[PDB]
Every structure is written in C-alpha cells, then in structure tokens.
Design a protein around this nucleic acid. Sequence first.
RNA 1: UUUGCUCCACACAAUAUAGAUGGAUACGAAUAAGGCGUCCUUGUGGCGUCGCUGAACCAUAGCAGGCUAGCAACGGUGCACUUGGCGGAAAGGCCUUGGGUGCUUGCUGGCGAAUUGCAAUGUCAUUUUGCGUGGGGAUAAAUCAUUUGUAUACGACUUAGA
RNA 2: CAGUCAAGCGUUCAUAGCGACAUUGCUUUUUGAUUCUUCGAUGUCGGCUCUUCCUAUCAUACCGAAGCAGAAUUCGGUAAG
RNA 3: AACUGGCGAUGCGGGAUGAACCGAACGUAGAGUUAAGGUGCCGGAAUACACGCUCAUCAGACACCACAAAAGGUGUUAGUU
RNA 4: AAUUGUUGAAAGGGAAGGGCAUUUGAUCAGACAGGCCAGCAUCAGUUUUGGUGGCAGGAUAAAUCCAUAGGAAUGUAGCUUGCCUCGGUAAGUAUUAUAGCCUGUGGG
Lengths: 197, 136, 191, 193, 172
Amino acid sequence: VEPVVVIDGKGHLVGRLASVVAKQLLNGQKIVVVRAEELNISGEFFRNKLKYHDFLRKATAFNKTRGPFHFRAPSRIFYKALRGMVSHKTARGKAALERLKVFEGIPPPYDKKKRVVVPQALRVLRLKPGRKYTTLGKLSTSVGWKYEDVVAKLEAKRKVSSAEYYAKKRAFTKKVASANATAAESDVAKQLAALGY
Amino acid sequence: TDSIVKASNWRLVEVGRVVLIKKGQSAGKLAAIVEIIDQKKVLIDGPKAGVPRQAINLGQVVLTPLTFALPRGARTATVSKKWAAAAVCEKWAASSWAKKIAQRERRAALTDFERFQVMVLRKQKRYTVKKALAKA
Amino acid sequence: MKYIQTEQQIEVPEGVTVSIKSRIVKVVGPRGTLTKNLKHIDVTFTKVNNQLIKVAVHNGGRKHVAALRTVKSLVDNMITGVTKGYKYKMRYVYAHFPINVNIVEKDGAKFIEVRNFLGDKKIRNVPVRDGVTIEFSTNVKDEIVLSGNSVEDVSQNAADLQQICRVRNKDIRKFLDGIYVSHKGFITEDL
Amino acid sequence: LRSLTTVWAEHLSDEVKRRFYKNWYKSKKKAFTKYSAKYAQDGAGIERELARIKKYASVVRVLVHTQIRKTPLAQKKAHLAEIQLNGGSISEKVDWAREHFEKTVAVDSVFEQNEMIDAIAVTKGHGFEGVTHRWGTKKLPRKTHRGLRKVACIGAWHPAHVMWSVARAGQRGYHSRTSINHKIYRVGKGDDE
Amino acid sequence: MAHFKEYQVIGRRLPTESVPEPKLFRMRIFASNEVIAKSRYWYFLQKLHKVKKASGEIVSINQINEAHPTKVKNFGVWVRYDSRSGTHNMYKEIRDVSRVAAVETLYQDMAARHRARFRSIHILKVAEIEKTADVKRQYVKQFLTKDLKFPLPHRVQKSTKTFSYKRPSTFY
RNA sequence: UUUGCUCCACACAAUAUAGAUGGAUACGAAUAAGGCGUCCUUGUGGCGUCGCUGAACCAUAGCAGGCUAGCAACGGUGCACUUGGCGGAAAGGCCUUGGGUGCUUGCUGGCGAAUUGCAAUGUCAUUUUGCGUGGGGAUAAAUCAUUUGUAUACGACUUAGA
RNA sequence: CAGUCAAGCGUUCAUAGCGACAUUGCUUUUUGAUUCUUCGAUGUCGGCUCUUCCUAUCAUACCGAAGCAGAAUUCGGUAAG
RNA sequence: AACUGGCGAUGCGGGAUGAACCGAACGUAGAGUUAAGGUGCCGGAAUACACGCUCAUCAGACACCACAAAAGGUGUUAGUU
RNA sequence: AAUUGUUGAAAGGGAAGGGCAUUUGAUCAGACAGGCCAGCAUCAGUUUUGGUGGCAGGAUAAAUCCAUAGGAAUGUAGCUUGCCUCGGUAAGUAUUAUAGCCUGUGGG
Ligand SMILES: [Mg+2]
Ligand SMILES: [Mg+2]
Ligand SMILES: [Mg+2]
Ligand SMILES: [Mg+2]
Ligand SMILES: [Mg+2]
Ligand SMILES: [Mg+2]
Ligand SMILES: [Mg+2]
Ligand SMILES: [Mg+2]
Ligand SMILES: [Mg+2]
Ligand SMILES: [Mg+2]
Ligand SMILES: [Mg+2]
Ligand SMILES: [Mg+2]
Ligand SMILES: [Mg+2]
Ligand SMILES: [Mg+2]
Ligand SMILES: [Mg+2]
Ligand SMILES: [Mg+2]
Ligand SMILES: [Mg+2]
Ligand SMILES: [Mg+2]
Ligand SMILES: [Mg+2]
Ligand SMILES: [Mg+2]
Ligand SMILES: [Mg+2]
Ligand SMILES: [Mg+2]
Ligand SMILES: [Mg+2]
Ligand SMILES: [Mg+2]
Ligand SMILES: [Mg+2]
Ligand SMILES: [Mg+2]
Ligand SMILES: [Mg+2]
Ligand SMILES: [Mg+2]
Ligand SMILES: [Mg+2]
Ligand SMILES: [Mg+2]
Ligand SMILES: [Mg+2]
Ligand SMILES: [Mg+2]
Ligand SMILES: [Mg+2]
Ligand SMILES: [Mg+2]
Ligand SMILES: [Mg+2]
Ligand SMILES: [Mg+2]
Ligand SMILES: [Mg+2]
Ligand SMILES: [Mg+2]
Ligand SMILES: [Mg+2]
Ligand SMILES: [Mg+2]
Ligand SMILES: [Mg+2]
Ligand SMILES: [Mg+2]
Ligand SMILES: [Mg+2]
Ligand SMILES: [Mg+2]
Ligand SMILES: [Mg+2]
Ligand SMILES: [Mg+2]
Ligand SMILES: [Mg+2]
Ligand SMILES: [Mg+2]
Ligand SMILES: [Mg+2]
Ligand SMILES: [Mg+2]
Ligand SMILES: [Mg+2]
Ligand SMILES: [Mg+2]
Ligand SMILES: [Mg+2]
Ligand SMILES: [Mg+2]
Ligand SMILES: [Mg+2]
Ligand SMILES: [Mg+2]
Ligand SMILES: [Mg+2]
Ligand SMILES: [Mg+2]
Ligand SMILES: [Mg+2]
Ligand SMILES: [Mg+2]
Ligand SMILES: [Mg+2]
Ligand SMILES: [Mg+2]
Ligand SMILES: [Mg+2]
Ligand SMILES: [Mg+2]
Ligand SMILES: [Mg+2]
Ligand SMILES: [Mg+2]
Ligand SMILES: [Mg+2]
Ligand SMILES: [Mg+2]
Ligand SMILES: [Mg+2]
Ligand SMILES: [Mg+2]
Ligand SMILES: [Mg+2]
Ligand SMILES: [Mg+2]
Ligand SMILES: [Mg+2]
Ligand SMILES: [Mg+2]
Ligand SMILES: [Mg+2]
Ligand SMILES: [Mg+2]
Ligand SMILES: [Mg+2]
Ligand SMILES: [Mg+2]
Ligand SMILES: [Mg+2]
Ligand SMILES: [Mg+2]
Ligand SMILES: [Mg+2]
Ligand SMILES: [Mg+2]
Ligand SMILES: [Mg+2]
Ligand SMILES: [Mg+2]
Ligand SMILES: [Mg+2]
Ligand SMILES: [Mg+2]
Ligand SMILES: [Mg+2]
Ligand SMILES: [Mg+2]
Ligand SMILES: [Mg+2]
Ligand SMILES: [Mg+2]
Ligand SMILES: [Mg+2]
Ligand SMILES: [Mg+2]
C-alpha cells in the first residue's frame, strides 16, 4: 500500500506483532516498529522473567561467545521474536529483514511521520479482560537493558512537543470546519451532498 | 462538592432493544430483541425490515442505542404494531449512524462520469473556502 | 458459571465526597483526603445519591465477583479512614531487657528507633510512613501508637516495627520478646 | 553516551601536537593550524560550540595533557586524555573549562593527604609464557615426558573441543588494570627542597 | 456428532408364520441424517429387546419438526454417560428454542465439561419445563428474572485490514 | 610520479537496482472507557455531539497533460531568493517575514491531437562510478629503512630522527 | 534413592522424630539380563594433572519445625554462589 | 511360535527427523480433483466460524512416539445422593 | 590424463559438487523468405466458478398470519392498602381492561 509502515508498538503482543511484521516483510512491505519498550507479552512479569532466564542459560559450552547471543533491549527481543518467523538464513530472508527497523522510543523521522496500529495484535483487543501481561520495557530492564530511564526522559519531552503540535492542529481544524460551514447550504455543497459528499 | 461518579453508559440486551444485524441474508437490516435466551443467544424479530423471527448469537448483530416499548416474547404482529407505533425507522433514519451508511452506499453507486462531476464540484467548494480560510 | 450481574453498596456520609474518574478513587472528608487506584480490577461504579454509590461486576467468574466485595471494602476503609481515622496500638513485651523505643530523625526522616532488643547492641530502625503519626502513649507502659487515615499505611507501619523485632536462634515460644499490635481502632472516640 | 562536540585551545604545545603525529621530524606540523583560525574572527564559531555543549551535554570532560618535557624521560610525545569534570552545573563545567585553555593544573587541586585513590595502568608485559607461570598451574612430575610445565589433561572427551575455561600458554602482562584504594602518603611539591 | 434433527423411528421383529403382526416399538432418535438415526435405533433396541437389524425391519422413519421454533423454552435434559472410571447418569437444563437446538449444545457441554464424546452419551429424556421455578439449575434461572437487561462490555471489533490508523475503542 | 584534490554548476557516457509509478496523512492517555465542540466555579466540571472502522482524508480533468485570450478573485500552489525562530535521540529537518516569478480546472474562449494503423511496460524512478570543460576553496601525510626498550617468537607495540 | 495407607515406636500421645504388613514409584557411579554398534583394532586398571557439569547439600547465606529452657542437635524450605 | 500385511528388493505424499506407521505403490508430460496430513509466522492454505473448559513462581499442544504412578488439593468446573 | 605457470571471464559470510525452474551475461542452430510469436471471434474435448427458470417430496414441511376455545404469570389496566416533596413507589387483589403471552382445535 505505502512505501514504509510505522508501527506504534505500545499495546502490541510480541508474537502477534512479530507474526504480522514477518509477513509484511516477506511480501515486500518495508516496516518500522517504534516504542518497542511499550510492547506487551501475555503472562505476568515473573513468568516472562523466568522465561528470559531459561533463554539466558543456553550458551556454547566450550566458548560462550560462539553460542546463542542474548540481547536485552526491548527491540532486540522484538527482532528476535521476528527473525525466527523468517527463513532468515536464506538469501530471501536477509532481503526481507533489511526492510525492517525496530526502535525504542520514536526517534527522528518517525516521530513526525504517522505511526499505525495492528488490531489483530492489539492486546486491549486480543487478551481477555483480567489476564495478566508484561511490558517489554520492565522485562528488558530486569535483565540488563541499560537505557530505560533515558528513553522515557527523551519520550516525556517528545510527547510535549507533540501535544503542542497537535494543539495548533486542533486549533486550525476548528477554522477549517468553521469555513466548511459558511460553504454549507450553498449550491456547490448541496450538490456534492447528493453525490455522497 | 457533591460526589461525582462517572457513568459508563452501555447499550443493553433487553426486550425492545433495536439491533442492526451484520452478517447473513438479513445483514444490514434492523431488528428488535423480543425475548432473551442467554448470555449469547437472543430471539430477534423484525417484521418491518423483512427479517424472520429467529434466534441469533449476539455476535452477529450490533446493538443500537434505540429502544422501544415491547412486551417480552411478543409475537410477530405485535412486534410490527409496536415498532411502527414507536416510530423506530425515522428515529434510526435520523441518526448519524444510518446516514453515514447511506453516505457510503451512495459513494459506491457512483458512475465514472458521476465521480468526475464530484471532482470539479470539490474543486469549486475548495476555491471559495480556501479563500474564506484567509479572511478572518 | 458466570453470574450475570452482582453489586455492592458504598454508603457515603455527610462529611465526605468520593469521586471516581476511570477507576481512580478520591474520598475526601474531614480528616484529610485519600486517593487509591482501582484500574487493576474491572468493576463499574455508579453515583446514585451523595449518600450512595454502587459497584458492579457484569458477567463475572467466581474469582471476578469475589474481588467485587473487596473493592467495596477498600473504599469503605477509605471513607471511614477519612471521617474517623485509624489508630493502631502496639505494646513492647520483654522478659529481662527493657526494649527502648524512640523517634530519631536523619534528613527530615522520622524513624522508629529500637535499642537493646533482647540486649542486642544493634540499633533497630523502622521508617515512619508518611501520613502516619506515632505517639508514645502516656499513662500506659511500653505502648506506642500509630494514627492516620490510611488503614493500609498504619497497619503496615504497625507491622514493620513488630517484625523488625523477630527473634532469631532461640525457642520463640519461651522467648516472647518483641513488639506486637495490641489493638486496632478509630481515631474519633465514642466511635 | 555519545560525544557531540570538542572545543580546543587556541594554542597547542609541541607536546600535544607531537602526539598527533608519527613522523614529526619530517612533518610540516600543520595540525590544528586551521582550527586555531577560529579565534581570529570575534570568536563566534567557538562560542557556538561551547554554547552547544552547555545547552546539551549531560557530561563534560576536559582534555588535558602531560608536560612530559618536565620529566626525565626521553619521550617528548606527551600523553593526552579526557578527564570528566565533577563540579556543579553543566554550564559551569564548560565555563571552568573554557577558562583554562592553555593554562595549567597541578596535583594538589586534585588530591589531598590521606586520600584513597585508584590507579589505572597497563601491567608490565612478559611476552609468551607457559601455562605454569601464566596461570600458576602445578608443575608436572619430573618423570614426565615431552615436558612438564603444562596442563596434562587439556580437556574431557566431551564436549570434544578444548574449552575456554582451560588454562593455556599465552601472552602474560601488558594487561589493563584498575587498582583501587591506594592511600596518598605525600603530595610533594617540586618547588620544595 | 453433527447438526441434529429429531427422528421418530419405528421397527418390528420380522414377522413369522405363527406371529404375524409383531408388536412395533418407536424411539425418538437425535441424529444428523436418517442413516445414523436408524443405526442408533437398532443400537438401543438391542439394549432392551431380543432384536437385531438382521431379524427385524424399520417400519417408518419420520422427521419431527419442533412445534414452536420461536418460543424460547427451558429444557431439562437427562443423560447417562461413561467416564474414564465408570458410567453415571446426569440431569442438565438447557435454555433454547427447539428440542433439537438443545440436544446440540448438550453434546457440546458434555464434551467440554466431561470430555465425553458422542459414543458415550445416552439421551435418556428431553422435556420442555412448563412452569418456571421448576427450573432447578442456576445457570438458567438467571435468565428468567423479571425485566432483565445487561450490557456487553469491552466490545471488540473485527478489523478487516491488517493495519489501523485509529486506536480502538471497546466502547459500547 | 605527468596538473593532482575538493565543494557547487552540465555534458556525454557507463554501471547498477529484493523491486516509485497520486500522497508514510505526527498528540497523549484510557479501554468496566474516550475523541471533538461548547459553557463555567478551570473540576475526577455542566452541557452537546460522535464511533459501530482508512469504504477516510487530501489530492486528482489539460500533447505524460502542448499553444494561446479573457473574466472573477487577492485565494492556491511550484520555484529560486530573503526575514525571524525552533529542533541533538539518529537533530540534518520543521515553522515564519517579505518582495520576484511560473501555474492555476474558480469561470468563459480560440487553436492542436489521427498514420503508434484493433493490445504488445511502449520507456518519464534513483544507484554509483568514469572522462573531459570553468564557478568557488585547499596545499598532507602514512609506510620501508634507521632508531628506543616502558615491547617482542615473527608480525605487532613503544620511542627517536631536517 | 523417594512415596502413599497408618498397625505401631515414641512415659502419655499414630505422623516432633520413626513406622509394620501391604502398596506406588524413581535413578542408571551397583549387578544382572540382552548381543544393537565396533574383531582389515574405539589402546585396556589406578594415580598424577586439570576443566566442566549434576544435586539425591557435608560446609557456608536466609529460613520454617521440634519431645527447641540455654548450649548442642535434629527434621524440613530457598539453595550447586 | 500362529494368521495376515509389510520391510527386505521401493521410490512418491504425511509422521520435523526415521527400513517397517498413515496415505499411495512409480513409462514421459498437461489441466483438473483428492488421500494421509495440514492452513498465526517460518510454509502453500480461514489470526474462520460456534459452545464450553484451562492461568501453571518449571501450563499445555495430536496416533505408532520418543514414558510417569499410588496418593492428595477449601484452584475452578459441571454432576450424584 | 592427473598435475602445473601465464592470461581472460566469473563466483565465493564454517566445504565443494547436484535436481526442477527462471532472471541476467556470453555463445549458437534453424527457420522467414509462408518462418517465430501473439490478440480477438466462432467451436471442440477436459474443467472450474457464478446469475437465473420449471418442477417432486414431508405433519402434502414445521412456523408467522387469521380465526376459536381454554389458560396462566417473570400479572397489563383498574381497585385496595402502606409509607412517601402533591404521584411514584412498594404488596395485595386481580386473567385482558389503558400491554401481552402460553396451549389445543380449525383455515389458507
Ligand atoms: Mg521488495
Ligand atoms: Mg552456537
Ligand atoms: Mg529465529
Ligand atoms: Mg524478500
Ligand atoms: Mg479482547
Ligand atoms: Mg462518557
Ligand atoms: Mg468507494
Ligand atoms: Mg528455629
Ligand atoms: Mg537453641
Ligand atoms: Mg557538530
Ligand atoms: Mg617513525
Ligand atoms: Mg636515559
Ligand atoms: Mg618483554
Ligand atoms: Mg620462564
Ligand atoms: Mg597441572
Ligand atoms: Mg619416561
Ligand atoms: Mg580456553
Ligand atoms: Mg449408531
Ligand atoms: Mg449392543
Ligand atoms: Mg453408554
Ligand atoms: Mg474474522
Ligand atoms: Mg538487488
Ligand atoms: Mg506525534
Ligand atoms: Mg488534549
Ligand atoms: Mg467526553
Ligand atoms: Mg474538551
Ligand atoms: Mg471566568
Ligand atoms: Mg477545562
Ligand atoms: Mg467534562
Ligand atoms: Mg480522516
Ligand atoms: Mg496546465
Ligand atoms: Mg481550455
Ligand atoms: Mg480583473
Ligand atoms: Mg494573482
Ligand atoms: Mg544527537
Ligand atoms: Mg534513523
Ligand atoms: Mg545533527
Ligand atoms: Mg505567487
Ligand atoms: Mg489542472
Ligand atoms: Mg516515454
Ligand atoms: Mg577541475
Ligand atoms: Mg625544514
Ligand atoms: Mg518401601
Ligand atoms: Mg494396617
Ligand atoms: Mg503427640
Ligand atoms: Mg499429634
Ligand atoms: Mg502409645
Ligand atoms: Mg501420614
Ligand atoms: Mg523406571
Ligand atoms: Mg535405564
Ligand atoms: Mg550408585
Ligand atoms: Mg553383534
Ligand atoms: Mg558388548
Ligand atoms: Mg575399524
Ligand atoms: Mg587407532
Ligand atoms: Mg575401546
Ligand atoms: Mg581415540
Ligand atoms: Mg593397538
Ligand atoms: Mg511432648
Ligand atoms: Mg533442651
Ligand atoms: Mg552445651
Ligand atoms: Mg522455609
Ligand atoms: Mg559452581
Ligand atoms: Mg548452574
Ligand atoms: Mg502392514
Ligand atoms: Mg513382501
Ligand atoms: Mg539381503
Ligand atoms: Mg517388497
Ligand atoms: Mg513401499
Ligand atoms: Mg517426506
Ligand atoms: Mg501422514
Ligand atoms: Mg522458522
Ligand atoms: Mg501462507
Ligand atoms: Mg517449566
Ligand atoms: Mg516442582
Ligand atoms: Mg528439571
Ligand atoms: Mg510454557
Ligand atoms: Mg492414544
Ligand atoms: Mg513426531
Ligand atoms: Mg498405594
Ligand atoms: Mg489422581
Ligand atoms: Mg477436583
Ligand atoms: Mg455418580
Ligand atoms: Mg567461518
Ligand atoms: Mg519460401
Ligand atoms: Mg510453421
Ligand atoms: Mg504464438
Ligand atoms: Mg468450451
Ligand atoms: Mg432452483
Ligand atoms: Mg408447499
Ligand atoms: Mg377466546
Ligand atoms: Mg408493554
């Protein structure tokens, strides 16, 4: 549809986002995921802490470096849920992956672009009301992720500049729907009204 | 300082709650909830709209904030006599829902040439409004 | 079996206006003002008349309905805690060593200092919670009293002291030393 | 942490200059000669950078360098490195820094008597070293053949790779070490018979 | 086992010289098609009489259409089933609109709550409960209280494209 | 060492390309709740309204979009210039002043289009490099050898040398 | 090596600590049974060395229990840092 | 040991993997329909429909098959007297 | 021939090589002078996916609908009662009234 699709991770269940991101990727659709730290996982935080530790223990015996690499940042956890849904050792897989970017926070460009949502992975729509779940930021920070405060600092300042942005915006669209009302009942407008508009 | 508690004002599964079907041979038509079977099943009838008396998952319908007087379990004719009476149809026809439906039904009847007339039309509105949006 | 609806009543008094936007609660009356968050729970409140508020669970499981009542409680305590107040009393108990208790401050702090517990040359400290006021009872021996509006802030500042005085390495039935909550009540008398 | 600018003295000793080169004696020594021009004009382009730091920068470090000529060494090519600055206010830290360009700073404004300091240096190096001295492995018995300053069992049979935790002959020394908790027993002065 | 129809079935012990006009027994089988229905008929007759298909004959197989299919009813249901540790009778109450639509959810309930598949249930009796308050079971009695109403909270909308530009409501 | 390097300009050439072909169209937060408008005592506020999908919004007519006349407006948009200001998370992009200029399908005209023969993507993206032209700007170093020994099996390290 | 029932031991008191007759398991450093792999060859005890892992924890950390007064011990939990 | 079917001597599809299981037995190809088995993504194929059940601080997840038992639970579920 | 040097082209993120298929590069035969390819129309064989017409069964579908008789309550109107801000409640009567429903029989 679009050259690049920006996804506001906040509120999205890891595997169900990874699943749809994988498929957009492989069907040629470049995708960028933001605010990965606000990503969700089914089950309370302990189960998912325990889970990451189970991961954490696997390493090559004779040389812990060649073995599995464990990445702490909410985005790299997210890329990891993704990469295993992609035939990533093939030519085609490296292809599809390069179309994907994952970030903590909403960094430049993408803070001014519009970012979009995935209903089929939206927790508030998916999970049963009353289940317990996990925020990827808390889960990352508990296993070594360093930059949780810096990010929320940088974001708490982002969401300011954007409220202003939105503010001016909502103020202007008040004029536009104002002018749009002088134009109503005219000849033009009532005609369009007939044609559905 | 009185107390001041929210609301959360739901549409309710009740007798005489009008309900807009969504999928099936009746899909798109309105209907009333006669009697109420359980937490999911309901018995609807809509003799105004040509929808037959039936049981139907509330899944397949969407409740509408319209509601009229109906005896529980009222048979089809009595349904038709109250529906009328209550003046349901114009009440729903008046609404921002049901208009925004017609709205999109129309935009999809459009003739290629009709579409083209819509373009110039909007060119015409746009000129004069983009103007006004610069004078106050 | 999913009970379709159930509800609990929250009586409201004459000195108090509780206010619930989303599921944030703020009871406010004479003794101060208390606010507690219930977003974790999923009930529907409903003002009915400056003396009454209702809370509701639609189509709930046994576990869900259960937490209904206990939502009503937590808001009654917030009410009663802001009209009357909460008073928790604990008395020291020792066998040979007078447990000696004080209120020490380091950096605007307010702690509860406990020395010579069972002799221990170690000095025990429990920080005074905010919203709670500790008084050493006059006219009664080895009584300490914690007061305030947050039942849950008193009762904990209560048990923090008691449990800072657990007995290690000795038969804990012959060695009944410690400080124990002896009596929980309200701040306004008569009631 | 990312560095976003680096403002420099107007004048640079042939000491710190000597560090930026590998064949000084041949070089035309033109390093910083265009940077130093930034002062010629009123300042502006250095004020703006110094100003940047202040508006941004959660950390400020000072570039200092040793006066190696004031030392008996033969080695002229002075050492330079970054010292974080720990007094108040970001804007104050740069003001302090701005203020010191080309001016000097000595040990007493840093350390005092009886202070506990850590040393950071690169251990004396010893080249290639058998496992006996480099890890302290037991000497094998005299009767043993094809040598004895070894580990005898390099590994189990499985996993069937000598492993990263076995001790093995290699370089010893020239390692970076951060030692802590050395007391200063004296902060001596040069001007002081 | 499928979507159910009710069938009356009728058979009789193949006639003999000295016993022409044998006696005729009917059942009401709850099955999906007429071929299963007769199978069941013989399954159960050989549980009461000396017959088998080999020696009898079906006299009439007739579908029975629910009498008032837009009259909500409260159905009592009587069952015998085999568990992994023995066999036991039961009674449940199903609120629906035709004897057959109830037999459907019965076999579902029996399957979900008691892991019992078709092969292990026997439908002893299904009966329209006339007066209320003979409705014994609670999960039904809930729905018979006067002027009953109830919301449907946290409503969740079937998104028809992969991406969305809003951020949903669950409002209702 | 054969007049080399670099930023801006155009020209020819080559070589690409995980896949342009109207527009990635910016609050935040909640979801057993919110968006928007409006009123006030500015609140966990009164009142109104909406959702039930972007099926939207914006754009979109003109030789792939040629040549020209005019009217109504004083609005729109493209460009190159300039005014003031913002943005360091990867800012490298955003907002604003003022003239000059192109276009305007807001409306009314004059002229052209065929023969590409009934379809054959019927070519209009953006990569990187190379060669000459002249509009700005800039005049190093690293290595070998020699050398120290704070280093070293050898490479490597560390010094020193107009 | 660990359970279940609990008749009994434990002054009294089944289960603090134990536990008959029975019965249910687990483990694969016992030993058997088997003969699938290797007889144009997998060098075959013990120690030395040295690494790593398991836990059915001997010590060390913090605990619950006691037929724990104190000191000592014992049963048990989190535990192989 | 018995009967049959197989593997051996046999590829193809399913069972990730695999002599023997499921399906189906092979000349070279095209179009179609399927079996066994599947259809979040890897991966062709409904993040399909409908009723329930389950929340596990070592959940669970498809025959052969890659194991668990007695005994318990005021977790919750529906039933019986 | 194995194996080797040079030169030329090309590929190379823990081997190489192979199968089916196609891109691109290089190279080549034949065939025009009816050769290679296509596009539409009408048809043929196989096939897949839609719109639509006429009929047969059944309790000659079962319902709704209509008429009729009976009935009850998750009891509509009225009445009574009791508080209760001039009626609204609540608990009583009370089966159709100022709503309706159930059950049988009959009709199309
Ligand atoms: Mg692509
Ligand atoms: Mg590995
Ligand atoms: Mg992976
Ligand atoms: Mg790809
Ligand atoms: Mg949901
Ligand atoms: Mg609201
Ligand atoms: Mg349309
Ligand atoms: Mg103890
Ligand atoms: Mg002791
Ligand atoms: Mg810079
Ligand atoms: Mg040199
Ligand atoms: Mg010397
Ligand atoms: Mg050395
Ligand atoms: Mg040596
Ligand atoms: Mg050794
Ligand atoms: Mg020897
Ligand atoms: Mg090693
Ligand atoms: Mg059968
Ligand atoms: Mg039988
Ligand atoms: Mg049976
Ligand atoms: Mg769907
Ligand atoms: Mg490519
Ligand atoms: Mg924004
Ligand atoms: Mg706002
Ligand atoms: Mg609102
Ligand atoms: Mg507002
Ligand atoms: Mg005012
Ligand atoms: Mg306001
Ligand atoms: Mg408001
Ligand atoms: Mg829009
Ligand atoms: Mg034009
Ligand atoms: Mg024209
Ligand atoms: Mg004019
Ligand atoms: Mg103009
Ligand atoms: Mg930056
Ligand atoms: Mg970036
Ligand atoms: Mg920048
Ligand atoms: Mg202009
Ligand atoms: Mg135009
Ligand atoms: Mg072209
Ligand atoms: Mg030039
Ligand atoms: Mg010179
Ligand atoms: Mg035993
Ligand atoms: Mg016994
Ligand atoms: Mg005892
Ligand atoms: Mg006892
Ligand atoms: Mg005894
Ligand atoms: Mg016992
Ligand atoms: Mg075993
Ligand atoms: Mg074994
Ligand atoms: Mg052993
Ligand atoms: Mg053998
Ligand atoms: Mg052997
Ligand atoms: Mg061999
Ligand atoms: Mg050998
Ligand atoms: Mg061997
Ligand atoms: Mg060997
Ligand atoms: Mg040998
Ligand atoms: Mg005793
Ligand atoms: Mg003792
Ligand atoms: Mg002792
Ligand atoms: Mg314990
Ligand atoms: Mg260890
Ligand atoms: Mg370990
Ligand atoms: Mg066989
Ligand atoms: Mg055979
Ligand atoms: Mg053989
Ligand atoms: Mg064979
Ligand atoms: Mg075979
Ligand atoms: Mg296969
Ligand atoms: Mg199979
Ligand atoms: Mg995969
Ligand atoms: Mg697929
Ligand atoms: Mg586990
Ligand atoms: Mg366990
Ligand atoms: Mg384990
Ligand atoms: Mg799990
Ligand atoms: Mg089985
Ligand atoms: Mg398997
Ligand atoms: Mg047993
Ligand atoms: Mg059991
Ligand atoms: Mg149970
Ligand atoms: Mg039973
Ligand atoms: Mg490699
Ligand atoms: Mg010819
Ligand atoms: Mg030919
Ligand atoms: Mg052709
Ligand atoms: Mg044909
Ligand atoms: Mg037909
Ligand atoms: Mg008919
Ligand atoms: Mg009658
Ligand atoms: Mg009514």
